[PDB]
Design a protein around this ligand. Structure first.
Ligand code: NA
Ligand code: NA
Lengths: 158, 149, 149, 158
């Protein structure tokens, strides 16, 4: 018994001239207010990691690049998808330094805060400081698998 | 007497919302698809509650909350669905994690916030991604009676 | 915090009902001659009160008390006077003298009795025979907030 | 700002094989329940001391002798009326020992509990014990005039 509109508000992460936002999954009637929050935080790029339960037509009509990169639940992202992530942030962070990139799963306690966590470890921040930062922003971030993956992976790519 | 309630207010600092909540199954809730007829309106009357949650397709997915004043000039002659009234007024939902101390969410209640609080707990108990599970509702009266009893 | 409410519950033993009452002039009351139309029914809705006194020809002469559940299947289409509903259900009136300590009438509230109490004081201040003057109303919420504030 | 149906319940006084009841003033719609209380306490005789605000027809139809003995408010009873009182109680107490006689003013904190107080001082009970008995039964019995009159009057008539 979980909720859809009962999750807490999206969280903004700022680190080393980078701005992310972890948020949750909307539903057809909601996206007016959701993308309202998107434009509020200044997000130019949204990465959907859960299954498609909303129409990308509105959010792309507002002028937000949306990227359907799903993978199985409870699992770490594949290497293809972390590639795409890192390069994506290189491009969209090269186009406007200070732009917020947003990412969402069912609720922002899954693969989305994992991807922003990898993005945090590659920008120079420690693993413990990263995970404690993210779940200090919204409690209960990741499962055991995602945390072990988060520890056992090494950064090199600016 | 006054002593027992002193130990009450002092025990607020330990007991969590999860000790005082009422599970979703037992809460009086309204489907967003219900229509305010004589029957349901009468149920809201004799419910003993002034703030009633309105869910959508599942008791867990609590969309909005209906205050008793929202029914001011509603007539069942027009079969009016309560979702219309839900988009008439906008009462904000108040959420609270299960392990919140009672003194705290008490001060939250007194700090203007609605006397009703939806209780959530994180659920890692599964190989999928963590999510917030809706346990139930906690109200001002629950805490007050936690001190006066 | 919890200390302030400890001094609250401890100060219940001193403060009288007369310190916490609300005078009759400010109380929301219903004339027994009113008819439950859309307007008055809506006022009861947006009143924020579930138990409302019903007086006869004078705010001081409180005859009965109307609970929110009494309005269950009442329709304003039939111009129904509330006095009919008053003789439908019979909720007993709870009376309390002005100088009653708050802890006491608190325990009275918890002992089943209605959460509303009509406050009376004897008035020898006149050459006529002593009589009971109605000062106003005191409710559970008044005392509870006397401890949580 | 006083009440009519908001006065507390009637009080029964028992002393030296005598049974009184002090009660309040009814109104046309109420006397069914009032005389219901009368028959509950076993009253055979009712003495109205306030003005007439109810019809004596019902209460006399139930079989209760009612006696309109009014006098001015806040004042002690005239000597005629205390005569009538004492003799009345001699007769109705001679007809059925243990019968309750009831008396009422506006609310039973006036001339009615005064008359039962005189009836108490004439049956052998002290003044202080009498007044403290009555207003211990219902608080705030009499004014200064009624209490001074109650002290300055002497009993002889069994
Ligand atoms: Na709303
Ligand atoms: Na009634």
């Amino acid at each position: 018994k979980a909720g859809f509109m009962n999750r807490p508000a999206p969280v903004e992460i700022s680190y080393e001239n980078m701005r992310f936002l972890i948020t949750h999954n909307p539903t057809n009637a909601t996206l007016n207010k959701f993308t309202e929050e998107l434009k509020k935080y200044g997000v130019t790029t949204l990465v959907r990691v859960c299954d498609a339960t909303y129409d990308k037509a509105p959010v792309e009509k507002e002028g937000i690049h949306v990227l359907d990169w799903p993978f199985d639940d409870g699992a770490p992202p594949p290497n293809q998808i972390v590639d795409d992530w890192l390069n994506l942030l290189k491009t969209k962070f090269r186009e406007e330094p200070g732009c917020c990139v947003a990412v969402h799963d069912v609720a922002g306690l899954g693969r989305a805060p994992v991807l922003v966590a990898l993005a945090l470890i590659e920008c120079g921040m420690k693993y413990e400081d990263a995970v404690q930062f993210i779940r200090q922003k919204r409690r209960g971030a990741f499962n055991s698998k995602q945390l072990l993956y988060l520890e056992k992976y090494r950064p090199k790519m600016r | 007497g006054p002593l027992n309630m002193i130990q009450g207010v002092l025990e607020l600092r330990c007991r969590t919302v999860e000790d005082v909540l009422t599970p979703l199954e037992d809460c009086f809730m309204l489907d967003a698809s219900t229509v305010l007829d004589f029957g349901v309106l009468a149920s809201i009357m004799q419910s003993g509650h002034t703030r009633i949650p309105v869910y959508e397709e599942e008791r867990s997915n609590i969309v909005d909350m209906l205050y008793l004043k929202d029914l001011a000039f509603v007539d069942p002659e027009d079969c009016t669905p309560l979702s219309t009234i839900t988009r008439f007024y906008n009462h904000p939902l108040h959420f609270v994690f299960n392990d919140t101390k009672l003194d705290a969410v008490l001060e939250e209640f007194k700090r203007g916030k609605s006397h009703l609080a939806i209780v959530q707990k994180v659920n890692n108990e599964g190989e999928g991604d963590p999510f917030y599970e809706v346990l139930g509702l906690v109200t001002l009266e629950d805490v007050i009676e936690e001190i006066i009893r």
